[PDB]
Every structure is written in C-alpha cells, then in structure tokens.
Design a protein around this ligand. Structure first.
Ligand code: PLP
Length: 228
C-alpha cells in the first residue's frame, strides 16, 4: 500500500483539511500519512483562528514518515505560513522522486482566513514548478496568477513553471456539475465534469498507486459520481 504524505491543516469540525485527505486517500486505495501544518479553530460557519505548526515540527513529522513508509506522492493543502511553504519546498527538493499534488489553499470554504493571501500567493511561486499536478479552483487560479481571464491565467501558471494543472470550474459549469479541465504542458489533455470538488488527495492516492495523471483524474471523477 503506497503512501501519500499530506502537508495539511486540521479542521476540528471534520469538514475539510487532513480529515478529508484521510477519507479520500483511503477511498483511492492508498495509505495516508500526515504532516500537520496547523491546528485550526473553526467550524462549518467560520474560522476563529489557527496555530501554525513551526517549520521544525512540520519537518519532524514528515521526516518520521520518511524511511518507514513507502512515500510515493506528497499532497499539500493548507500550509498557513510562508515558513511552512518554504519547509515543504525544502522537503520536496530533498525528494525529487516523490510526486507532488499542490492544492493551493488560500482561504477556507467558509471564507475565513487560513493565512495572509498576498504573502501566500507570493510564496507559492516556489512550489508551482515542483508539482506533478496543481489543482486550483477558479479563484485560486486567478489569485496565483493575478489574471482574471481563465484561459490566460491557465497559460500564466504554465509560464510560472507548472507541469500540469487541473482547473476546477470554468465557463462550462452548470447547477449540477462543475467542469474540470486537465492541462499538461499548456495543452488541454482531458475535459471532464465533477458532480457538485476536492480531488487533490484522491488523485494523489491514485498517482501513488501508479496511475497516469489522466487515469488518476478519471478515477477521481468516477469516485465522486459513485457517491452520487
Ligand atoms: C484546514 C483546511 N484545509 C483545507 C480546506 C480546503 O481543502 P480540503 O477541504 O479539500 O482539504 C479547508 C476549507 O476550505 C480547510 O479549513
């Protein structure tokens, strides 16, 4: 059972964060390991605050997993601080053989703060070229690039060094479905939907199990359509 190591925050209410990573990775067929980036204080309605994990304790968790478990993929969600973004980049550069799924979490779904967005956007520059796949929703895509046109923003992310981008949402969305577009090396590789879209951890698990990107993304949609 290949392992996905998740650099993710803890949401006590269990709606998001490393709990959702654990659930998705288990359903993908892989094993989840966790390097907790923050203990948040939040529920479905608001974020009250959070205590970011120090860079030292973050790397200590990650390094405890290294050597014990067969890490094949890293996934990141909430990182909280620019220190933790830098620590993850340091970790990834020490392990270029790991695949990496970057979910560029800038805000909570409730709207509450999971860190200062402007400085997080600037710090994410370092992680963009390291990712096997970046999974921005349309808000995250625009924030990372400073570009409001989705097509132009996607291309800008590739100019910034992205290798593959799964854009969640776009001009093809409807009340029943969010449309996802998988781009590889700047070119549209697969155009799909998703009934509703938190795909990064499930995709990471499928990548850990040896799937190609296209097959992993397809499995993730089948998983969500199976919930429906
Ligand atoms: C701690 C935390 N991580 C991540 C997310 C969103 O990413 P997922 O719910 O896919 O982990 C949220 C909420 O939006 C969150 O509060």
């Amino acid at each position: 059972r290949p392992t996905v190591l998740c650099f993710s925050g803890l949401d006590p209410s269990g709606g998001a964060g490393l709990q959702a990573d654990i659930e998705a990775i288990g359903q993908s067929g892989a094993h989840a390991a966790i390097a907790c980036t923050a203990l948040t204080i939040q529920n479905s309605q608001q974020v009250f605050g959070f205590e970011a994990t120090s860079k030292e304790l973050l790397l200590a968790q990650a390094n405890a997993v290294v050597g014990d478990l067969p890490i094949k993929c890293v996934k990141s969600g909430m990182l909280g601080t620019t220190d933790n973004i830098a620590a993850l980049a340091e970790f990834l550069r020490a392990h270029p053989d790991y695949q990496y799924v970057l979910d560029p979490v800038l805000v909570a779904n409730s709207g509450g703060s999971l860190g200062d967005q402007a400085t997080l956007v600037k710090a994410f520059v370092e992680l963009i070229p390291l990712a096997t796949l970046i999974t921005p929703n349309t808000v995250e895509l625009r924030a990372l690039t400073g570009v409001t046109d989705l097509d132009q923003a996607t291309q800008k992310l590739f100019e910034m060094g992205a290798k593959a981008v799964l854009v969640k949402g776009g001009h093809e969305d409807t009340p029943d479905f969010i449309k996802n577009s998988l781009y590889i090396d700047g070119e549209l590789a697969a155009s799909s939907t998703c009934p509703r879209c938190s795909l990064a951890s499930f995709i990471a698990g499928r990548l850990a199990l040896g799937d190609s990107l296209k097959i992993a993304v397809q499995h993730a949609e089948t998983w969500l359509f199976g919930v429906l």
